[PDB]
């Protein structure tokens, strides 16, 4: 697939305002996620005993996570589709190392989606909340691809 540069605008204007408190936005998406999905806490080895939503927010390595999984994903939406050489380490450890299904990739686009929709909502309407999810779409369809030929396809 391929997004217009209209489309791409709409992305990175809602991103620049994500960027205003990268912590804050990473934070909320993984709780977001670990709530609607609580299989997936179960693959960070530094965390995965957390048992509430207070003590997820009092993590600091939860929030060092979202840092890290924000600006990674941030670097890969600036390119604007040309991302192959952002997303082979990705692909290898996700793949090799951490074992993350395309599934679960799935449901961190969905919290990512909420959090925007909640925090930015001038800023997110229809169009651009469309325009974001064939981002991510584009992100998850190139990273299995590259999950195949690395032997994983999971
Ligand atoms: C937007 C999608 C994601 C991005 C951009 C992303 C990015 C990253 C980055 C940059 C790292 C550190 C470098 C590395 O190990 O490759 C990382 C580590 C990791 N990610 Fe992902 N990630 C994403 C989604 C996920 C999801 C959905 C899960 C699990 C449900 C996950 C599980 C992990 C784990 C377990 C680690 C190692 C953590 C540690 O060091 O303790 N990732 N991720």
Known sequence: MVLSEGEWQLVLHVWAKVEADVAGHGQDIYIRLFKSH???LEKFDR??????????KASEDLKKQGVRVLTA???????KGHHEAELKPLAQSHATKHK??????????????????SRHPG???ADAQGAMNKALELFRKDIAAKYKELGYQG
Do not use: Q
């Open 38 to 40: 609580p299989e997936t």
């Open 123 to 125: 800023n997110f309407g």
């Open 100 to 117: 993350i299904p395309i599934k679960y990739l799935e449901f961190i686009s969905e919290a990512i989606i909420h959090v925007l929709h």
């Open 47 to 56: 965390f995965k005993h957390l048992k509430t939503e207070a003590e997820m």
């Open 73 to 79: 994903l941030g670097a890969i939406l600036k390119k």
